[PDB]
Amino acid sequence: SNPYERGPAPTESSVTAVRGYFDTDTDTVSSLVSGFGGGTIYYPTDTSEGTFGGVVIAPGYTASQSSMAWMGHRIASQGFVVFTIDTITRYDQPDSRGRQIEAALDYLVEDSDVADRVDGNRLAVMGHSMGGGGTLAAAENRPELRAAIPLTPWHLQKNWSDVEVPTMIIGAENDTVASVRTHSIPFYESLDEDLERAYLELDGASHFAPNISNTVIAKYSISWLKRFVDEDERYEQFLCPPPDTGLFSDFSDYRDSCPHTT
């Protein structure tokens, strides 16, 4: 059986809930850490079912932890150790954000007081905007990563055909900052035809959708992490078959590689 399965059999309820099964706590990481600006670790207090996958989440240009904080307890409560990092400076570029995510993954797995609850073999990267660009850069440098979720990603590099990490790109229909025509769709279309991947385009959404509690983003993020970080087939349910994308659907567009096999 899957040794990495955590939590009860999921429902539409459970995956869209503001808090899942697991009681969660936080540890704060100082800006004194090398390689990034610190952050907050959100982690399940219940260790009886075994260790959890670790997930670093990077902010965008001018922003910090607080723009992504809502994902902390909401993802962690599903059975993840979730690291909402700050960057060294608010003006750090995507490649720099990418390096800061890698440092944060290493800090989480090697140095954090919760490292004993993280399975260092099962790690994921997420990030908003330039942090999304950062997420691709990390995914590209670290093919051992189980899952990558760029959110309204921004990057001057368009070609990511080398990424070996299951990639869910969530775009915003009406994004004028990281336009899906010039960022998300070029990035998605460049992925290996053999790679496990999704493109979610949120209907009439703006660049800031990822910084506001969003049930679509959370459901599909948790499903993607469960499927690839935990190899949890029980979440294939939520990803495959793909959802409808007519005009009062959550999605102006949805691209998929169903079924997933891990």
Side-chain angles (χ1 to χ4, degrees):
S1 63
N2 190 346
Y4 305 120
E5 272 187 7
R6 305 280 169 276
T11 58
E12 202 49 42
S13 274
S14 76
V15 84
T16 59
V18 158
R19 292 294 167 268
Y21 176 72
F22 289 102
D23 178 84
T24 51
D25 212 326
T26 56
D27 268 39
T28 302
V29 177
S30 164
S31 80
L32 290 173
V33 290
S34 266
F36 65 103
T40 311
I41 307 173
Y42 306 77
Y43 66 89
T45 63
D46 182 352
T47 59
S48 59
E49 306 186 20
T51 51
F52 301 96
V55 182
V56 160
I57 310 176
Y61 191 73
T62 78
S64 54
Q65 258 196 81
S66 67
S67 79
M68 310 305 273
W70 72 264
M71 311 203 158
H73 282 295
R74 196 154 170 173
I75 298 188
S77 50
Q78 297 281 350
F80 296 103
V81 185
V82 180
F83 200 11
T84 63
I85 72 164
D86 285 335
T87 60
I88 290 167
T89 85
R90 272 163 184 287
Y91 311 101
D92 296 347
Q93 300 298 310
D95 283 341
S96 182
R97 296 179 184 264
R99 275 294 297 283
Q100 290 187 61
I101 295 175
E102 297 185 62
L105 287 157
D106 293 337
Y107 176 81
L108 184 65
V109 167
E110 260 122 52
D111 301 309
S112 81
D113 277 332
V114 297
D116 60 323
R117 290 175 207 235
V118 182
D119 177 353
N121 311 285
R122 311 190 292 105
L123 303 167
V125 292
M126 317 177 50
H128 176 227
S129 196
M130 279 197 189
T135 305
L136 289 168
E140 181 186 48
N141 211 35
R142 286 181 173 220
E144 69 264 24
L145 284 165
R146 295 299 192 81
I149 317 180
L151 309 157
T152 63
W154 191 106
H155 212 305
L156 299 192
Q157 191 191 303
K158 307 306 179 187
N159 189 347
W160 299 94
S161 57
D162 290 346
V163 177
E164 299 191 21
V165 176
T167 290
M168 173 172 276
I169 294 159
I170 308 175
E173 184 171 26
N174 287 346
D175 205 326
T176 55
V177 178
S179 130
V180 296
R181 272 193 218 176
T182 57
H183 293 262
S184 296
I185 297 165
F187 309 155
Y188 181 79
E189 294 190 330
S190 81
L191 293 167
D192 213 293
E193 48 277 47
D194 286 331
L195 175 66
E196 288 309 2
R197 65 195 185 280
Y199 174 53
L200 277 48
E201 189 180 291
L202 304 150
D203 183 293
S206 85
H207 194 57
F208 305 121
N211 302 131
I212 304 151
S213 287
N214 178 313
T215 307
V216 177
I217 288 184
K219 178 190 166 156
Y220 281 86
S221 291
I222 290 157
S223 298
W224 195 261
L225 299 173
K226 277 281 196 181
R227 191 57 192 83
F228 293 102
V229 175
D230 291 1
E231 306 174 43
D232 202 338
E233 276 196 54
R234 299 177 303 160
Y235 286 78
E236 186 69 358
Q237 216 168 329
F238 302 112
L239 298 164
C240 295
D244 251 69
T245 58
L247 280 288
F248 294 81
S249 164
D250 298 319
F251 304 113
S252 54
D253 195 10
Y254 197 111
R255 319 194 185 175
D256 77 81
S257 53
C258 300
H260 309 117
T261 49
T262 59

